[PDB]
Amino acid sequence: RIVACDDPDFLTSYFAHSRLHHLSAWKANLKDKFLNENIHKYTKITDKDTYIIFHIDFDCFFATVAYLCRSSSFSACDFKRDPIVVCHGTKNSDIASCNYVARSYGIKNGMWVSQAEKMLPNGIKLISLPYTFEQFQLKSEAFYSTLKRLNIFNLILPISIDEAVCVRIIPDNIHNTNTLNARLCEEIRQEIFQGTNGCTVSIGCSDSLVLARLALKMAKPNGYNITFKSNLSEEFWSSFKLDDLPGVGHSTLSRLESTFDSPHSLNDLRKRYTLDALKASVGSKLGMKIHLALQGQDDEESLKILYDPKEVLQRKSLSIDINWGIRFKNITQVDLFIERGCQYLLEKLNEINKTTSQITLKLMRRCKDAPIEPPKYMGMGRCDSFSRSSRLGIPTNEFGIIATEMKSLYRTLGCPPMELRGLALQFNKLVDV
DNA sequence: GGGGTGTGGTAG
DNA sequence: ATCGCTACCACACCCC
Ligand SMILES: Nc1ccn([C@H]2C[C@H](O)[C@@H](COP(=O)(O)OP(=O)(O)OP(=O)(O)O)O2)c(=O)n1
Ligand SMILES: *[C@H]1c2c(cc3ccc4cccc5ccc2c3c45)[C@@H](O)[C@H](O)[C@@H]1O
Ligand SMILES: [Mg+2]
Ligand SMILES: [Mg+2]
Ligand SMILES: [Mg+2]
Ligand SMILES: [Mg+2]
């Protein structure tokens, strides 16, 4: 029934179930597809061009598709009336996606099922649907195909399985730009709904990447929003949390909330901040990025994907990360796992016709004062992260060289097998042919 | 007195 | 039970 981490089937089984594995693998495939489809198309934007960004994503993607494709066992439930989540388990299992009914009760993606169940009023039951991974891929394919078929974008950039940044180069100062672009948003939404047999998308439309992303958030669910730099207002900025900004996650949020005393929205932040205080709080680069974002402007790093997508989407490293289900008794089993992981990576490296000249082993070790078993079944729990890299010299795809050095890096780090809670094996530098 | 490594962080 | 991946950016430290 259960495949343990010392079983040869473990990696196959874990990756077959892991939604985060699928997200990353799908993204890697989409980047490759982009490169292959545009090998003769030399399209890119310059700092002289005027353009409009359409940032397009599916509403509650896994929930929508899992519902549409649900087994006969779930015939009864109603996507507009019932709170619906996609997950594996029944207690401390991540909600991959939840529908907007579930969200009306305060349920959010990434919440455990056990937290979610508490938020429902008595009587109302949470509906848990299984993942339909294959069908997520087919719906994505129909999405990307529709975007291309419309023949309206100069550039279509894959962000994720359910999300694309689509660029139209346009003349500066078009008359009736808001109406003309609204019509495009309406057409796009209709075509994708038809082309995916009933999945909805939202669209954020602007003249910068950062504003198009924010506009998309404002549009959800099942809508569009057009907010150009010239349309910015306090009311717009009042609608966004600080971590709605790209590059602001949980850690950066914590720092900003401390420095600026818990602003409730981007408008509150806009009113309190200085560039110097930002940089002191979150560092020079991120500080500048945020400052620019609060003016509706993109930083230069973010713009690289417009100016040279082929360079940006090129793969520069290859790794696996397993930080769930890792429970080893001894070093013999750790070594066998490292060997299997190295072969998995070599099969991928060989499939993309590359070699590697540098590797890294990263591990998660149980914190001294953390419980031996965490609350989440097979979770890593609270850990310290340690890593060591090695240059191999000449670029290679030889198992003997790579795997031997990986096992050696494990020994240098000195983690007792019973304290190990996660492992990452990385090929950091790749060379073609 | 500039750069390589380990560490921390972000996005779906 | 439950499936906490993975590419890529940033930067503090520490070298002699
Ligand atoms: N930590 C994450 C992030 C995303 N996903 C998966 C499930 C989501 O359905 C899909 C797309 O991610 P989004 O962040 O776009 O979330 P949704 O599409 O579910 O909702 P929204 O309507 O907010 O876009 O990726 C996941 O499993 N775990
Ligand atoms: C697991 C992990 C870590 C950090 C965080 C921080 C904030 C979180 C909020 C909500 C859910 C959640 C789940 C897993 C998390 C979270 C959060 C890291 O410290 C750890 O290494 C893992 O990524
Ligand atoms: Mg989204
Ligand atoms: Mg989505
Ligand atoms: Mg998305
Ligand atoms: Mg954010």
Numbering used by the authors: 306 to 738
The authors write:
Rev1 is thus unique among TLS polymerases in its protein-template-directed mechanism of DNA synthesis and its specificity in incorporating C opposite template dG. That is, the enzyme embraces the template–primer DNA with its palm (residues 356–365, 438–536), fingers (residues 366–437), and thumb (537–603) domains as well as the PAD (polymerase associated domain; residues 621–738), which is unique to Y-family polymerases. An α-helical substructure at the N terminus, an N-digit (residues 305–355) augments this embrace and makes critical interactions with the incoming dCTP and the templating base. The ability of Rev1 to evict these bulky adducts from the DNA helix and to position Arg324 as the surrogate protein template residue allows for the incorporation of a correct C opposite these stereoisomers, consistent with the previous in vitro studies.
The structure of the 10S (+)-trans-BP-dG-containing ternary complex was obtained by molecular replacement using the 10R (+)-cis-BP complex as a search model and refined to 1.85 Å resolution and Rwork/free 17.0%/20.8%, respectively. The thumb and the PAD are positioned on opposite sides of the DNA duplex and are connected by a long helical linker. The incoming dCTP does not pair with templating 10S (+)-trans-BP-dG; instead, Arg324 (from the N-digit) acts as a “surrogate” residue and makes a set of complementary hydrogen bonds with the cytosine base of the incoming dCTP as observed previously in the unmodified structure. The modified dG is evicted from the DNA helix by Leu325 from the N-digit. The 10S (+)-trans-BP moiety is placed in the solvent-filled space between the PAD and the template–primer DNA helix. The low average B-factors for atoms of the BP and the modified dG moieties (32.6 and 20.8 Å2, respectively) are close in value to the B-factors of the atoms of protein-bound portion of the DNA duplex (24.5 Å2) and indicate the well-ordered alignment of the adduct. Interestingly, the BP pyrenyl ring system points towards the 5′-direction of the modified strand. This is made possible by the modified dG base tilting by ~ 44° in the 3′-direction to create room for the BP moiety to extend in the opposite direction, as shown in Fig. 3a, b. The hydroxyl groups at the C9 (C9-OH) and C8 (C8-OH) of the BP face away from the W–C edge of dG. 2-dG adduct differs in how it is accommodated in the Rev1 active site versus free DNA, the torsion angles α′ and β′ defining the local conformation of the carcinogen-DNA linkage site are similar in both cases and are in the most favorable range for a 10S (+)-trans-BP-dG-modified nucleoside, namely α′ = 180 ± 40°, β′ = -90 ± 40°51.
